[PDB]
Amino acid sequence: GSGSSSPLPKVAHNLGFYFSPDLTQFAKLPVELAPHWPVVTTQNNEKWPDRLVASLRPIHKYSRACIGAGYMVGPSVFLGTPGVVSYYLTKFVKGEAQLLPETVFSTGRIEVDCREYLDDREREVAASLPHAFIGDVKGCHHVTSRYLPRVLPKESVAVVGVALCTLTDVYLPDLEAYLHPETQSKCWKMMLDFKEVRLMVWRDKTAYFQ
Amino acid sequence: SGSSSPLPKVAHNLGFYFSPDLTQFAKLPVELAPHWPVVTTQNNEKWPDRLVASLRPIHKYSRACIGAGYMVGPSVFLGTPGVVSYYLTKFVKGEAQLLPETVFSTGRIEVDCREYLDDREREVAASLPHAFIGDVKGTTVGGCHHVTSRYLPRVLPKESVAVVGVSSPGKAAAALCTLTDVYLPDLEAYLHPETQSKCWKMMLDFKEVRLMVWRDKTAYFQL
Ligand SMILES: [Cl-]
């Protein structure tokens, strides 16, 4: 085939997949060894009983649509498009597909140094929550933060979903429900790129990942 | 009987507290009504800032308040889904204003009626049991966000969005949780988001609120 969209490495790493016979963003594995080790791949090869398959279309009932996720096609990073499936993930363990958990996704903006809003809806959420992810601590920045300098030394930045700061590019409308407190200050447990993270939201709508 | 009138909170949310005639509001001398915003059932042109409650429309900008709790004299009555409880017409500086769209509280909090208004509401409650019925996980009670929910205390604040502690005696608690008595089918259109969570902006009793929905899990209002 011509190739498929595929996860940013963090997504597969957080699911416990590090090697690939075919995907350049992961550690190379000889294809001869893929039958005997878990691999992330775009080839739904039944000879590889432990595999995380990324595909353009579903391949099984348990295929997970990864919507608005950053992704890669060959060497190139693409930004998530809100409401559009970036890729499907199907996890096989000993030949059997497994139900994957729900999660929100990083958008790929960090990887390509994009500081722009994905759409007007995101812009409006930011405007309504001016103390969410702008380095306020009682720091954590969204890629769209008004206080992020143009030149960030990458070496010293901690990425949320895995320091100088912590950095996130989550589509803000996926977090909006969390960012207005029901009653009190709250520390949410949530899944981002299949990794458990903590989102701290103070009564004054100051918010950051821990 | 006579003219139905809003629950106090509806008028308060529009900036009206004084009334020359309505007992549920702060009494104002009629001679001062030309100088204060007044909620009233009298469409008196001498009171240029006034919120007129009427049984029938009085202007093109009269807003039908459908299914809202209401008062006639000192008695509070439940709203009936799909039936107009009263009309509201807001005048600022003598000119009728367009009122925005809103959902309405049903009067259940004020009379302490904790029953479903009909089978349709019961059914909506059952479609999101965490949100509207409530449940217990360990020492934590989740999702008691309606006047019909479990684990509620005996005194509920008379508010559009009430804040309350909830208890499963000897088992679980939650210190603060928001609660309304809105007719749950009014929210149906907001309860099936494509996304795993969504924040809707809307009005409840003319107060700007947000409805947070988590797909197939929970929903609650926030001020
Ligand atoms: Cl909840």
Tab-separated table of C-alpha atoms in Angstrom, chain B:
chain	number	residue	atom	x	y	z
B	1	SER	CA	-57.007	32.938	41.223
B	2	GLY	CA	-55.346	35.563	39.007
B	3	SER	CA	-52.152	36.512	37.206
B	4	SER	CA	-49.308	34.100	37.456
B	5	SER	CA	-45.915	35.613	38.242
B	6	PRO	CA	-42.306	34.436	38.183
B	7	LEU	CA	-40.472	32.642	40.927
B	8	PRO	CA	-38.256	35.292	42.603
B	9	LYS	CA	-35.007	34.009	41.049
B	10	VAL	CA	-36.247	34.537	37.448
B	11	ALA	CA	-36.838	38.256	38.050
B	12	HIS	CA	-33.620	38.583	40.115
B	13	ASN	CA	-31.591	37.127	37.223
B	14	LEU	CA	-33.000	39.946	35.011
B	15	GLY	CA	-32.119	42.615	37.639
B	16	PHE	CA	-35.576	43.089	39.189
B	17	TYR	CA	-36.063	42.823	42.958
B	18	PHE	CA	-38.626	45.494	43.923
B	19	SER	CA	-42.348	45.202	43.270
B	20	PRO	CA	-45.178	47.542	44.176
B	21	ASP	CA	-47.755	44.693	43.902
B	22	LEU	CA	-46.207	41.171	44.058
B	23	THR	CA	-45.751	39.732	47.547
B	24	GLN	CA	-42.846	37.402	46.689
B	25	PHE	CA	-40.646	40.415	45.918
B	26	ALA	CA	-39.351	43.238	48.134
B	27	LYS	CA	-42.223	45.710	48.611
B	28	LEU	CA	-41.598	49.183	47.165
B	29	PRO	CA	-43.814	52.262	47.697
B	30	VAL	CA	-45.746	52.904	44.466
B	31	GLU	CA	-44.469	56.517	44.499
B	32	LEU	CA	-40.875	55.162	44.072
B	33	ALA	CA	-41.745	52.736	41.234
B	34	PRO	CA	-40.917	55.376	38.573
B	35	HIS	CA	-37.314	55.400	39.898
B	36	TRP	CA	-36.554	51.654	40.349
B	37	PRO	CA	-36.625	48.595	38.124
B	38	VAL	CA	-39.895	46.919	39.159
B	39	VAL	CA	-41.306	43.442	38.578
B	40	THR	CA	-45.071	43.704	38.402
B	41	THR	CA	-48.316	42.503	36.807
B	42	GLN	CA	-49.318	46.123	36.029
B	43	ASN	CA	-48.106	47.463	32.685
B	44	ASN	CA	-47.763	50.992	34.042
B	45	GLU	CA	-46.063	53.386	31.614
B	46	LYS	CA	-45.151	55.615	34.583
B	47	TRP	CA	-42.577	52.888	35.490
B	48	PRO	CA	-40.097	53.029	32.585
B	49	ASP	CA	-37.894	50.170	33.821
B	50	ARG	CA	-40.294	47.334	34.485
B	51	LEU	CA	-40.628	43.597	34.067
B	52	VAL	CA	-44.301	42.897	33.435
B	53	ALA	CA	-45.627	39.407	34.193
B	54	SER	CA	-48.891	38.720	32.364
B	55	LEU	CA	-51.210	35.848	31.638
B	56	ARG	CA	-51.449	36.891	27.973
B	57	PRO	CA	-48.933	38.569	25.651
B	58	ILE	CA	-48.855	42.394	25.871
B	59	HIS	CA	-46.227	43.217	23.210
B	60	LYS	CA	-44.357	41.581	20.291
B	61	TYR	CA	-41.412	41.056	22.679
B	62	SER	CA	-43.526	39.338	25.354
B	63	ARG	CA	-41.661	36.098	26.044
B	64	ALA	CA	-43.770	33.012	26.773
B	65	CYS	CA	-42.340	31.298	29.875
B	66	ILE	CA	-43.165	27.671	29.124
B	67	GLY	CA	-43.179	25.033	31.880
B	68	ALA	CA	-41.873	27.438	34.511
B	69	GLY	CA	-42.792	27.325	38.172
B	70	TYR	CA	-44.956	30.298	39.072
B	71	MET	CA	-46.823	32.082	41.810
B	72	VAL	CA	-50.353	33.369	42.247
B	73	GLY	CA	-50.337	35.417	45.422
B	74	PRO	CA	-48.258	33.650	48.073
B	75	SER	CA	-48.769	30.163	46.519
B	76	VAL	CA	-46.168	28.494	44.320
B	77	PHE	CA	-47.277	26.168	41.525
B	78	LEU	CA	-45.367	23.645	39.449
B	79	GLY	CA	-44.845	24.338	35.776
B	80	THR	CA	-46.505	22.003	33.290
B	81	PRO	CA	-44.263	20.973	30.355
B	82	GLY	CA	-45.388	22.668	27.119
B	83	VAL	CA	-47.889	24.997	28.843
B	84	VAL	CA	-47.206	28.742	29.183
B	85	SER	CA	-46.991	29.664	32.882
B	86	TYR	CA	-46.842	33.440	32.257
B	87	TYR	CA	-45.463	36.003	29.774
B	88	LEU	CA	-42.632	38.401	30.600
B	89	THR	CA	-42.153	41.787	28.998
B	90	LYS	CA	-39.091	43.854	29.904
B	91	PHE	CA	-39.134	47.621	29.471
B	92	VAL	CA	-35.948	49.657	29.809
B	93	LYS	CA	-36.443	53.453	29.624
B	94	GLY	CA	-40.049	52.915	28.480
B	95	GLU	CA	-39.049	50.715	25.497
B	96	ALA	CA	-39.824	46.989	25.273
B	97	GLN	CA	-36.684	44.863	24.949
B	98	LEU	CA	-36.103	41.541	23.245
B	99	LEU	CA	-35.644	38.865	25.928
B	100	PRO	CA	-33.231	35.983	25.266
B	101	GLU	CA	-34.105	32.284	25.088
B	102	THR	CA	-33.893	30.310	28.347
B	103	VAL	CA	-34.927	27.107	30.069
B	104	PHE	CA	-36.955	27.477	33.265
B	105	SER	CA	-36.908	26.015	36.751
B	106	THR	CA	-40.133	24.122	37.427
B	107	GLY	CA	-41.001	25.307	40.956
B	108	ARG	CA	-40.226	21.888	42.455
B	109	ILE	CA	-37.462	23.212	44.699
B	110	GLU	CA	-39.715	25.976	46.114
B	111	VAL	CA	-42.610	23.608	46.976
B	112	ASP	CA	-40.248	20.699	47.827
B	113	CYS	CA	-41.834	18.350	45.300
B	114	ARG	CA	-39.209	15.732	44.396
B	115	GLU	CA	-41.300	13.777	41.887
B	116	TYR	CA	-40.831	13.435	38.153
B	117	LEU	CA	-43.261	15.636	36.227
B	118	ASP	CA	-44.091	12.764	33.850
B	119	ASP	CA	-42.887	9.452	32.331
B	120	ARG	CA	-40.830	11.267	29.730
B	121	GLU	CA	-38.692	12.851	32.486
B	122	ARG	CA	-38.362	9.510	34.310
B	123	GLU	CA	-37.125	8.050	31.013
B	124	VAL	CA	-34.537	10.828	30.451
B	125	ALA	CA	-33.327	10.350	34.039
B	126	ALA	CA	-32.910	6.595	33.349
B	127	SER	CA	-30.871	7.311	30.167
B	128	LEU	CA	-28.154	9.046	32.277
B	129	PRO	CA	-28.561	7.436	35.729
B	130	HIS	CA	-25.242	8.727	37.046
B	131	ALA	CA	-26.192	12.351	36.176
B	132	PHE	CA	-29.809	12.321	37.344
B	133	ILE	CA	-30.377	9.445	39.824
B	134	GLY	CA	-26.985	9.204	41.554
B	135	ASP	CA	-24.803	6.317	42.633
B	136	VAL	CA	-22.162	5.331	45.168
B	137	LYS	CA	-18.590	4.184	44.530
B	138	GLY	CA	-16.773	3.486	47.814
B	139	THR	CA	-17.039	6.598	50.014
B	140	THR	CA	-18.028	8.830	47.078
B	141	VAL	CA	-21.518	9.664	45.857
B	142	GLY	CA	-21.623	10.719	42.213
B	143	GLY	CA	-24.233	12.402	40.083
B	144	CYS	CA	-27.057	13.772	42.214
B	145	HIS	CA	-27.713	16.766	40.009
B	146	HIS	CA	-31.525	16.826	39.964
B	147	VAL	CA	-34.321	17.555	42.431
B	148	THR	CA	-35.487	13.962	41.823
B	149	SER	CA	-32.019	12.468	42.605
B	150	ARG	CA	-31.023	10.217	45.479
B	151	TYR	CA	-29.015	11.211	48.550
B	152	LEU	CA	-30.384	14.788	48.742
B	153	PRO	CA	-30.763	16.764	51.994
B	154	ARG	CA	-34.088	18.063	53.319
B	155	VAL	CA	-33.343	21.774	52.605
B	156	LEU	CA	-32.509	22.716	49.028
B	157	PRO	CA	-31.445	26.303	48.301
B	158	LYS	CA	-34.093	28.221	46.326
B	159	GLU	CA	-31.740	28.983	43.464
B	160	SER	CA	-31.516	28.381	39.711
B	161	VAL	CA	-28.385	26.269	40.258
B	162	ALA	CA	-28.442	25.107	43.868
B	163	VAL	CA	-25.327	23.890	45.690
B	164	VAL	CA	-25.786	21.006	48.102
B	165	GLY	CA	-24.007	18.227	50.015
B	166	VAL	CA	-25.184	14.682	49.321
B	167	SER	CA	-25.085	11.593	51.543
B	168	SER	CA	-25.556	7.843	51.342
B	169	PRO	CA	-25.913	7.356	55.139
B	170	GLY	CA	-23.166	5.233	56.684
B	171	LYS	CA	-21.460	4.762	53.281
B	172	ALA	CA	-20.622	7.786	51.131
B	173	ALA	CA	-20.737	11.565	50.685
B	174	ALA	CA	-19.940	14.458	48.362
B	175	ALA	CA	-19.463	17.914	49.928
B	176	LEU	CA	-20.550	20.091	47.015
B	177	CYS	CA	-22.716	19.232	44.042
B	178	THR	CA	-24.895	21.375	41.774
B	179	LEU	CA	-28.583	20.727	41.389
B	180	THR	CA	-31.540	22.011	39.359
B	181	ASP	CA	-35.219	21.142	38.970
B	182	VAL	CA	-35.386	21.729	35.207
B	183	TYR	CA	-37.685	19.496	33.152
B	184	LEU	CA	-35.072	16.965	31.986
B	185	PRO	CA	-36.435	16.528	28.441
B	186	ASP	CA	-35.503	20.230	27.838
B	187	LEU	CA	-31.878	19.085	28.076
B	188	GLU	CA	-32.168	16.013	25.711
B	189	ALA	CA	-30.693	17.941	22.770
B	190	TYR	CA	-27.510	18.585	24.819
B	191	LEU	CA	-26.995	15.054	26.210
B	192	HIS	CA	-25.626	13.204	23.128
B	193	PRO	CA	-22.370	14.889	22.127
B	194	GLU	CA	-20.122	13.401	19.434
B	195	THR	CA	-17.143	14.101	21.684
B	196	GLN	CA	-16.368	12.485	25.045
B	197	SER	CA	-17.108	15.772	26.824
B	198	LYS	CA	-18.727	19.088	25.928
B	199	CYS	CA	-19.437	22.466	27.539
B	200	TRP	CA	-22.719	24.051	26.392
B	201	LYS	CA	-23.559	27.724	27.078
B	202	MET	CA	-27.227	28.466	27.796
B	203	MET	CA	-29.612	30.278	30.087
B	204	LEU	CA	-31.582	28.913	33.038
B	205	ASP	CA	-34.153	31.361	34.468
B	206	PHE	CA	-32.343	34.009	32.333
B	207	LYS	CA	-29.016	33.352	34.124
B	208	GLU	CA	-25.995	32.483	31.961
B	209	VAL	CA	-24.898	28.961	32.864
B	210	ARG	CA	-22.807	26.171	31.424
B	211	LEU	CA	-23.978	22.566	31.035
B	212	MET	CA	-21.125	20.109	31.189
B	213	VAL	CA	-21.831	16.768	29.528
B	214	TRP	CA	-19.656	13.655	29.511
B	215	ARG	CA	-20.917	11.247	26.813
B	216	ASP	CA	-22.868	8.329	28.350
B	217	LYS	CA	-21.670	9.298	31.846
B	218	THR	CA	-22.822	12.520	33.479
B	219	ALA	CA	-24.064	16.055	33.109
B	220	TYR	CA	-24.340	19.034	35.412
B	221	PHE	CA	-24.837	22.759	35.401
B	222	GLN	CA	-22.315	25.328	36.510
B	223	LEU	CA	-22.583	29.113	37.101
